[PDB]
Amino acid sequence: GSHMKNSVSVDLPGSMKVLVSKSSNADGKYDLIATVDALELSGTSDKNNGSGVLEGVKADASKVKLTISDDLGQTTLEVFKSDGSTLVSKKVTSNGSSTEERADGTRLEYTGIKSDGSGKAKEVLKGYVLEGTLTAEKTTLVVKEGTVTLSKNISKSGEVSVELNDTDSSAATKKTAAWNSGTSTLTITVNSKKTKDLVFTSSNTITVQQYDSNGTSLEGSAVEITKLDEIKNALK
Numbered sequence: 460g461s462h463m464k465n466s467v468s469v470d471l472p473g474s475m476k477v478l479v480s481k482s483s484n485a486d487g488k489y490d491l492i493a494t495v496d497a498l499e500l501s502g503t504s505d506k507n508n509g510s511g512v513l514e515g516v517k518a519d520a521s522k523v524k525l526t527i528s529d530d531l532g533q534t535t536l537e538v539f540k541s542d543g544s545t546l547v548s549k550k551v552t553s554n555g556s557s558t559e560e561r562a563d564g565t566r567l568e569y570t571g572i573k574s575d576g577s578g579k580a581k582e583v584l585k586g587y588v589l590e591g592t593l594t595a596e597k598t599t600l601v602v603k604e605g606t607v608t609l610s611k612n613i614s615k616s617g618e619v620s621v622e623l624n625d626t627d628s629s630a631a632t633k634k635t636a637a638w639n640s641g642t643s644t645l646t647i648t649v650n651s652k653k654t655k656d657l658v659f660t661s662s663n664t665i666t667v668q669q670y671d672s673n674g675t676s677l678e679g680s681a682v683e684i685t686k687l688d689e690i691k692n693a694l695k
């Protein structure tokens with residue numbers, strides 16, 4: 460039915476919004492509501508400006524907690540396991556930057572974020588840092604070697620896919636590659652023979668394995684990459 464608006468919408472960093480109540484309850488508290496990646500979070504605050512803590516629970520039982528700083532300059536979005544204390548992920552966002560920290564210690568860092576949503580991206584992994592760009596569509600981290608560019612894409616849902624392009628002026632030495640989304644594996648081909656598989660693991664590591672001289676089967680064992688140089692060597 461027709462009704463009084465009992466909340467105001469407040470703008471936060473990273474195009475987030477929070478609804479805060481116009482008046483306080485008997486405990487002196489203002490009600491807060493926000494929708495974050497399709498989950499409605501709710502909380503109460505002793506401030507009237509939109510700052511405070513909101514909580515929600517995902518379908519898989521994980522606990523979500525959003526902390527909005529007093530001056531509205533920063534937001535922290537934590538996801539915990541159903542125990543409410545084992546941290547799965549933490550994303551901290553301000554005007555112009557954001558950092559996502561994973562359970563395994565790796566981070567995605569976004570800086571210089573522009574009015575169109577684009578910016579610089581860095582993925583801090585064990586042993587090395589991958590850099591690239593953020594757009595409103597996705598994050599792309601690149602490694603380059605000669606005329607080859609390897610591109611690791613991360614979708615807005617966190618899904619990883621990889622692609623390779625080679626501007627080599629010689630057809631015979633040009634690298635091409637195909638991605639297998641079921642195995643998160645990139646297979647590189649040169650001169651009509653598969654040469655190596657780059658496996659992007661669930662542990663945020665990469666492994667490399669060579670094919671035999673005929674391109675018909677993998678040989679040896681997969682080697683875990685620990686250095687950026689090893690990725691560049693794979694692209695030679």
Ligand SMILES: [Mg+2]
Pocket residue numbers: 623624625634635636637
């Ligand atoms: Mg290709």
